Symmetry: D2
Subunit: 260 residues, 4 copies
Amino acid sequence: QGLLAGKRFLIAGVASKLSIAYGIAQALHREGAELAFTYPNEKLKKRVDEFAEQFGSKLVFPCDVAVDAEIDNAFAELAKHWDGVDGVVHSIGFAPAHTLDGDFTDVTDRDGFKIAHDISAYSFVAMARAAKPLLQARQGCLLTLTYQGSERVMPNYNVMGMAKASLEAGVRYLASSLGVDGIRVNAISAGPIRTLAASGIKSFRKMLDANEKVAPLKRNVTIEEVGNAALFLCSPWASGITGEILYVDAGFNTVGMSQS
Amino acid sequence: QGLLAGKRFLIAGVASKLSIAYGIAQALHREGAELAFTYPNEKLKKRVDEFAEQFGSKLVFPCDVAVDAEIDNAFAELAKHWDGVDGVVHSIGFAPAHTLDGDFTDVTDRDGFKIAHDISAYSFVAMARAAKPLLQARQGCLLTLTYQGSERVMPNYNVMGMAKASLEAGVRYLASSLGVDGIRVNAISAGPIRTLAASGIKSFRKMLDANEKVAPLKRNVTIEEVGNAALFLCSPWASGITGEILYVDAGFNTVGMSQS
Amino acid sequence: QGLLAGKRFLIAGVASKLSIAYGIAQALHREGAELAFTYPNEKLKKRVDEFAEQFGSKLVFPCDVAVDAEIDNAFAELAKHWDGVDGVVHSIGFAPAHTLDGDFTDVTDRDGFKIAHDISAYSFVAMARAAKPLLQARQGCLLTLTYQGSERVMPNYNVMGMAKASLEAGVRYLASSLGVDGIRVNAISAGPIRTLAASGIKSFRKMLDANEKVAPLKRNVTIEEVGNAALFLCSPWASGITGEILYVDAGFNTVGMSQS
Amino acid sequence: QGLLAGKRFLIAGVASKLSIAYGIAQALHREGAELAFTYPNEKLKKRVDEFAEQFGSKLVFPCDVAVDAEIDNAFAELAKHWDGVDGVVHSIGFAPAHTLDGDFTDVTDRDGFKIAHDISAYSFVAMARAAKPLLQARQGCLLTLTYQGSERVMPNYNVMGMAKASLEAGVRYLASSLGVDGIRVNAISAGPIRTLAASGIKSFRKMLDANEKVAPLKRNVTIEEVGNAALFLCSPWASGITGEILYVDAGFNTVGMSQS
Ligand SMILES: NC(=O)c1ccc[n+]([C@@H]2O[C@H](COP(=O)([O-])OP(=O)(O)OC[C@H]3O[C@@H](n4cnc5c(N)ncnc54)[C@H](O)[C@@H]3O)[C@@H](O)[C@H]2O)c1
Ligand SMILES: NC(=O)c1ccc[n+]([C@@H]2O[C@H](COP(=O)([O-])OP(=O)(O)OC[C@H]3O[C@@H](n4cnc5c(N)ncnc54)[C@H](O)[C@@H]3O)[C@@H](O)[C@H]2O)c1
Ligand SMILES: NC(=O)c1ccc[n+]([C@@H]2O[C@H](COP(=O)([O-])OP(=O)(O)OC[C@H]3O[C@@H](n4cnc5c(N)ncnc54)[C@H](O)[C@@H]3O)[C@@H](O)[C@H]2O)c1
Ligand SMILES: NC(=O)c1ccc[n+]([C@@H]2O[C@H](COP(=O)([O-])OP(=O)(O)OC[C@H]3O[C@@H](n4cnc5c(N)ncnc54)[C@H](O)[C@@H]3O)[C@@H](O)[C@H]2O)c1
Ligand SMILES: Cc1c(CN(C)C(=O)/C=C/c2cnc3c(c2)CC[C@@H](N)C(=O)N3)oc2ccccc12
Ligand SMILES: Cc1c(CN(C)C(=O)/C=C/c2cnc3c(c2)CC[C@@H](N)C(=O)N3)oc2ccccc12
Ligand SMILES: Cc1c(CN(C)C(=O)/C=C/c2cnc3c(c2)CC[C@@H](N)C(=O)N3)oc2ccccc12
Ligand SMILES: Cc1c(CN(C)C(=O)/C=C/c2cnc3c(c2)CC[C@@H](N)C(=O)N3)oc2ccccc12
């Protein structure tokens, strides 16, 4: 009987044990919560399926946010199992890798632009919509994962900075739209962490050595710290907070410039 | 021989004499600038043609930013007449009217989302791409028109707030990509102004009366003030300014709350 | 002893049961923490003495933040009782009441400015300094209470918005200075709450009805919501968070404007 | 007959020809404006006299902003000569040198804190107060100089970041207070420039070499660019802009991190 004793949460975005969604579910489950999970397609089905079993869960549903139907169906199927929900966790983001390696103006084609904002920004809205009925039942909350690359230019993040900026806008518009139903909508601007989202980025290690050099805490954050922060926002202790972007980056965002 | 004696500028987004692009072109031409124009489709050709000649210009090219080819071709044809360019003004934006009338989570369908970010956000980048060669010739600048609904939730702006947030992020990513070539990329966060962008918005009228009550200057801004500010950002006096979001809103953005 | 099992915390700024520090101390003690308290002068001593005892504490020390000596003594005396500290909560703020009633520029005198910035902004730094030794012992954290009037113009806040702006800056400079010692420095930007800080503000009730009308959650925050958030920032779950300004305002900060 | 034909502006803060105030006066005077000048004390009197003489001005008044009388007197004396004013330029800032060399928590004593916010933050309000009557005559404007060190932690800026945060807050509270009378209150967040404000800072060259390495334009800004930007804000072209913090930093503020 911890903090989330009796609470339910759906965790979309578990791709590996390094995924941020993993540390969240772990932190949430640690406090007594019951978890549900989605996977983008069959290839991930079996992996997410027993990630669920780690958390005492057998609720694993296919949800490709690119498909409108999959979203509603994934929530249709979930309505079949659960009465309501105390929160939905959206840890999804993607852009064609070519748009993230090279010059912004060059690699940012129309299609690469379309994909980035659809999967990474609109999905949180489409999910929030399909998830709205179940969230109201328990005055649940909504949580997404953003990155300060929306507010500040990082090399090679490119259209993902545009997407995250759009996402952050959606959080405010969702929190404002869903605030009347007791549904808090918040986001976490988490520091850089080497997950499966770092594959293909040749500069990452230098970037990590760099973030380590600038962060006020002189270190990079972990999915546990992120998970605990997510755990808080999804908790009754975070009842008075909506539309907030919380920076779990070791204060990195607050530094103008560091010793050479 | 005024301030822009001998400078050239392409004005995309002139649809009538109310268009913000119109008040900008007015300010530029007033200071000796040379003007070129595009139109979204044939229906506007004769109207833009008519405005172009009004400013001593006969350079009018079809440019539907939804079409990749139309963008580059409009710039291909423009290269035939002009050597280089000192600045590109991006006053274009659009989202399906249904996505701008009603509840955010509800009315924001996937397609309305795609269109909003495509026409209003990606186009400035695609244009920025197609315009680079002419900009490099004269170390021109880039200017777009944003709205503070990206930073704060306004009713009925909905997916346009996500788009403008993406746009404003792109400005930073563009200014950073094109900064090594002397090309300044900036944006103006202009106060609300009753142009053809207000068609279909039933609440616009009350919205305008509100800004009037809150803006520190107790008034709404004009396309002249926006045009005069745009004229400046496109001017050598703004040489030490890139990636800047300039708020020409009579200070409304800086007010937390006003007398009841 | 749940989250704050075995932790010690000094709470300066307990003036009544409505004080934000009160709801904070409540949340901390609720989670098993041992509490210490300061009082500004003799008149409050017996109340703070009594306030400490409500939380199983008899460690009550005089701390007038205007006096450098009074500051250090309270921590000298505290050093006598406690080895180290897991966090210091700075819930202090003050400006001459005249500076908060009328137009900002008329009422903003030099001394009212001096007092406001002295007591409300420098105090967190002087305290952070005198408290540094005890924080290093346990790598404690620092927490202060800010107000969004620093980022946005509210009527009658006047020099307190300038002071809060300085304070919020100090948090970043403190978090960066004390971050190498494991001391996270954060702040909570709490929504408006009718505490003893509302005495003399004739407009409070209308303002409270206003935030109630604007906050996405359609309500005003409580010292419990504020206290729980402080509990988090003072908790190991907030280990990856420093220099952060956390908004416990029911998302009010995220609303550009709502139907009036 | 340029842009400021017939406009008057007072330039407080001219200490040398490198001072930002100098490049502004030059830019304003270049466009036909008439100039007045103050000096902090006797030692600078003859020097300010000489610069005023450069700009066709012999209006030089003693103004130590630390003395309330000097402020009002300087404006009393100025009111005698000029009818009204189209703008007041506040280019003053100071903090005890000891508070700007070392660790923030250490060197920030109570007095060093008092002085910094007094001279650098309160002066703009006291001057804005003493300047209000002359500004109303011509619907003048107010301009101050801020630094992004208020929003982000720079090494050794320390308490000056708190002051700049207060200063920047005052701009909004001033712009909001004076906006109803047509007086626009704005500020320029100018990049680092080696003026007489850099004396005693051993780290400057590395800091400057860094900004040069990070600034999107790969260069540092000049007082001419700042002066031209100030000229704009003090101009009718900036009529729709109040309470705005304009970043003349070569876009440096918009960069999260650069190639190592
Ligand atoms: N890794 C970082 O440094 C970082 C920092 C800040 C924010 N974020 C964001 O946090 C979120 C989680 O990233 P991560 O670190 O866990 O990497 P990850 O690859 O381990 O997890 C991201 C998940 O998005 C899923 N996904 C992608 N496309 C999908 C689709 N069409 N339908 C359904 N699911 C889809 C992926 O399957 C994956 O599980 C992302 O949005 C990311 O942008 C990441
Ligand atoms: N009108 C306001 O209140 C206001 C305030 C602040 C910012 N803005 C934004 O600044 C810009 C100024 O717009 P405006 O005031 O001149 O209104 P406007 O309607 O007159 O101009 C918008 C132009 O975008 C063009 N356009 C739309 N879709 C296109 C496409 N697929 N291809 C090519 N062109 C296309 C339209 O033809 C139009 O000329 C807009 O982006 C607007 O969102 C508007
Ligand atoms: N109530 C709100 O709406 C609100 C919202 C956001 C932030 N805050 C801030 O929270 C903090 C606590 O205020 P509150 O709302 O709990 O009201 P409060 O009156 O109960 O507490 C204010 C505290 O300021 C302390 N103080 C003042 N001068 C002092 C001195 N010279 N020496 C030592 N201590 C001194 C006092 O100990 C007092 O307890 C304030 O800084 C306030 O600005 C308040
Ligand atoms: N140097 C930069 O990079 C930079 C950038 C942005 C803003 N600023 C700030 O804007 C202003 C521009 O500074 P600068 O570059 O011209 O350096 P500067 O040293 O040449 O000018 C500072 C002036 O403030 C005057 N002054 C100091 N104390 C005073 C007092 N008690 N009363 C009256 N006057 C007093 C000084 O005499 C001096 O003329 C400063 O406040 C500065 O902090 C500086
Ligand atoms: C930091 C940082 C991140 C992590 N992060 C904040 C994200 O949101 C990550 C988005 C992201 C989306 N799509 C991707 C990839 C990543 C690469 C995985 C690959 N498998 C792929 O095809 N597509 O990504 C970066 C990219 C460039 C520069 C910096 C960063
Ligand atoms: C403010 C404000 C604006 C002006 N503004 C800042 C914009 O950027 C306006 C974008 C906008 C894009 N697409 C539109 C329309 C407008 C309506 C024209 C119609 N013809 C249409 O089909 N599509 O529009 C609003 C809409 C709803 C709520 C508030 C606002
Ligand atoms: C909101 C809001 C607050 C609460 N809050 C966020 C604060 O930070 C409160 C500061 C504050 C500082 N000093 C004060 C007082 C208040 C009045 C108590 C009295 N005892 C006094 O002498 N001095 O106060 C306001 C004042 C004017 C307008 C709005 C507000
Ligand atoms: C950058 C940067 C600046 C320039 N800048 C933006 C400012 O506003 C500088 C204000 C400033 C105020 N007071 C000062 C001094 C400067 C040193 C002159 C000396 N004579 C003194 O006693 N007092 O100053 C810095 C100080 C430390 C670290 C970095 C910087």
